[PDB]
Amino acid sequence: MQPQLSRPQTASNQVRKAVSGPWSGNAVHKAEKYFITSAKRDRDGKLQIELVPASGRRKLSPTPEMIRRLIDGEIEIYILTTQPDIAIDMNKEIIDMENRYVIDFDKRGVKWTMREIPVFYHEGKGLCVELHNKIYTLDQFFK
Partner 1 sequence: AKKHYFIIENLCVGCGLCLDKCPPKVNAIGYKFYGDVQEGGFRCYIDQAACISCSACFSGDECPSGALIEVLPDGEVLDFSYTPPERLDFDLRFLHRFHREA
Partner 2 sequence: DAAKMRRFLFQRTETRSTKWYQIFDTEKLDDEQVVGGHLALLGVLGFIMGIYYISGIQVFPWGAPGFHDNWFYLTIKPRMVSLGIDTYSTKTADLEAAGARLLGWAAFHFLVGSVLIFGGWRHWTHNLTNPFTGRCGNFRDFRFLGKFGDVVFNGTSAKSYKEALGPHAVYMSLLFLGWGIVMWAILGFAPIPDFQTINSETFMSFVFAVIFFALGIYWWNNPPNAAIHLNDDMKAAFSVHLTAIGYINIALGCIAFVAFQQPSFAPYYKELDKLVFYLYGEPFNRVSFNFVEQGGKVISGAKEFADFPAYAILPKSGEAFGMARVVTNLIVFNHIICGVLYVFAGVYHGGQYLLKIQLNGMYNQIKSIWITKGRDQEVQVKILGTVMALCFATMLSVYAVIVWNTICELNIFGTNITMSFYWLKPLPIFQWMFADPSINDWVMAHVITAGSLFSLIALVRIAFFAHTSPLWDDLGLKKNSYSFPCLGPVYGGTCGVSIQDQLWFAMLWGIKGLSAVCWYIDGAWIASMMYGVPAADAKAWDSIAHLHHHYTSGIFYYFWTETVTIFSSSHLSTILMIGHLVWFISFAVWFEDRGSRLEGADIQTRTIRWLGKKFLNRDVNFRFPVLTISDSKLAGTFLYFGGTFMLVFLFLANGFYQTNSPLPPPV
For residues 52 and 96, give the distance between their C-alpha atoms in angstroms, rounded to a whole number. 30
Provide the 3-class DSSP secondary structure of residue 113. coil
The neighbour count for residue 70, using CB atoms within 10 Å, is: 21
CA–CA distance, 126 with 72 (Å, rounded to integer): 15
What residues between 22 and 51 interact with partner 2 by CB under 8 A? 22-24, 26-30
Residue 35 contact partner, candidates partner 1, partner 2, none, CB within 5 to 8 A by sort of partner: partner 1
Query: According to the binding rule CB under 8 A, does residue 9 interact with partner 1?
Result: no
Sorted by sequence, the CB contacts under 8 Å of residue 102 that are 6+ apart come out as 109, 110
Q: Is 91 in the site for partner 1 (CB under 8 A)?
A: no
# residues near partner 1 by CB under 8 A? 39
From candidates 16, 30, 31, 33, binder to partner 1 by CB under 8 A: 33
Contact 9, 3 (CB under 8 A): no
> 123 near 62, Cβ under 8 Å?
no
Q: Can you give the binding site for partner 1, defined by CB under 8 A?
A: 18-21, 23-26, 28-29, 32-33, 35, 37-38, 50, 52, 54-56, 59, 80, 82, 98, 101-106, 108-116
Q: Can you give the binding site for partner 2, defined by CB under 8 A?
A: 1-10, 14, 16, 19-24, 26-30, 103, 105-106
